[PDB]
C-alpha cells in the first residue's frame, strides 16, 4: 500500500472513520499501525472490485 500510496506525512489517520457514539476508551484505537493496515485492506478491496461495476 505504501508503494501504491505513500504516507510520508502520516496523514492516513487525518480523515479516518470511527464511531463517535462509543466512549473514548473503547471506540477505536487510531494507532498508526492499525490505521495503516485499515487503509491497506480498504485499498486492496477497492482494487479487487472494478470501479465501473460497483464501488466502495
Amino acid at each position: 500500500y505504501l508503494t501504491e500510496h505513500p504516507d510520508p506525512n502520516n496523514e492516513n489517520i487525518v480523515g479516518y472513520n470511527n464511531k463517535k457514539c462509543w466512549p473514548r476508551d473503547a471506540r477505536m484505537r487510531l494507532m498508526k499501525h492499525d490505521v495503516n493496515l485499515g487503509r491497506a485492506v480498504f485499498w486492496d478491496i477497492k482494487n479487487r472490485l472494478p470501479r465501473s461495476v460497483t464501488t466502495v
Binding site: 489517520i13 479516518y16 470511527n18 463517535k20 473514548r24 476508551d25 471506540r27 477505536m28 484505537r29 487510531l30 494507532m31 498508526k32
Partner: protein, 222 residues
C-alpha cells in the same frame, strides 16, 4: 462644575483611615494571582473553570476538542500523571498545558513582593526598625578586606560644605501618613484627579474580586 478635585496628603491620610473598614488590606497585585480579569478571560475561553471562578457556556460547540480519538502519542498508556493537571495548571500556562489553546488571553506572571509595614502607633517614629523585620548580622569584622583611606592625612573639607539637606527633620509627623498612602488602593493612591458619578462607584467591587470570603456557607460561594 465640581469635576476635578485638587487636595492635600493629610486629607488622603484621614480618608484612608476612615475607609479602612470598607477597603481590604491587600496591597500587592500578586494576591490576585488567578483572579485577575485575564485569568477569567482565559477560563471563559475554555471549557475548564477554576474552582474559584464561575462556570461558563462555551462559545462554540467545540466537538473537535471535546473527545478526541486515541492516537499513537495521545494514548494514556504512555502518559504518566504524577499529579492531576488541574485547571490552575491550564490557566497559568494556557499555551503549554492545553492542546489547541486557540483564542486565549495572557496573564501577568509576577509582581515584586510589596515589602511594606503598616503603621501601628502614630507616636512611634516612622523610620524605625520594626520587630517583624529580620535582624541582620552586626558582625564586628575586625578584618579590613575592604579598602581603607588615609588616617588623618587627607580629605580636607571646607566648613561651608554642609551635608546638603540640613536643618530639616529627617522624620516628620506626616512621613508615616504619606508613605502609607503611597501603597493605598486605586482611589487613594491619586493625590488629585477628576470626579466620578455616584452610581458608578462600586464599593463591593473589591470584595468578590478577592480570592474568597473564607469561612462562608455554600450559598455565599454561589
Amino acid at each position: 462644575t465640581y469635576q476635578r478635585w485638587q487636595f492635600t496628603l493629610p486629607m488622603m491620610s484621614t480618608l484612608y483611615r476612615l475607609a479602612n473598614q470598607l477597603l481590604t488590606d491587600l496591597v500587592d497585585d500578586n494576591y490576585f494571582y488567578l483572579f485577575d480579569l485575564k485569568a477569567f478571560f482565559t477560563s471563559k475561553a475554555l471549557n475548564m473553570a477554576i474552582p474559584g471562578g464561575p462556570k461558563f457556556e462555551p462559545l462554540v460547540r467545540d466537538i473537535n476538542l471535546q473527545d478526541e480519538d486515541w492516537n499513537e502519542f495521545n494514548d494514556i498508556n504512555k502518559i504518566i500523571i504524577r499529579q492531576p493537571i488541574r485547571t490552575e495548571y491550564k490557566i497559568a500556562f494556557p499555551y503549554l498545558y492545553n492542546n489547541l489553546p486557540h483564542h486565549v488571553h495572557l496573564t501577568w506572571y509576577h509582581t515584586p513582593n510589596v515589602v511594606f509595614i503598616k503603621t501601628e502607633d502614630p507616636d512611634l517614629p516612622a523610620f524605625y526598625f520594626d520587630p517583624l523585620i529580620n535582624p541582620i548580622s552586626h558582625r564586628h569584622s575586625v578584618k579590613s578586606q575592604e579598602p581603607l583611606p588615609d588616617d588623618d592625612e587627607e580629605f580636607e573639607l571646607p566648613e561651608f560644605v554642609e551635608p546638603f539637606l540640613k536643618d530639616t527633620p529627617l522624620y516628620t509627623d506626616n512621613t508615616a501618613n504619606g508613605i502609607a498612602l503611597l501603597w493605598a488602593p486605586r482611589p487613594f493612591n491619586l493625590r488629585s484627579g477628576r470626579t466620578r458619578r455616584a452610581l458608578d462607584i462600586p464599593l463591593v467591587k473589591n470584595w468578590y474580586r478577592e480570592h474568597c470570603p473564607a469561612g462562608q456557607p455554600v450559598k455565599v460561594r454561589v
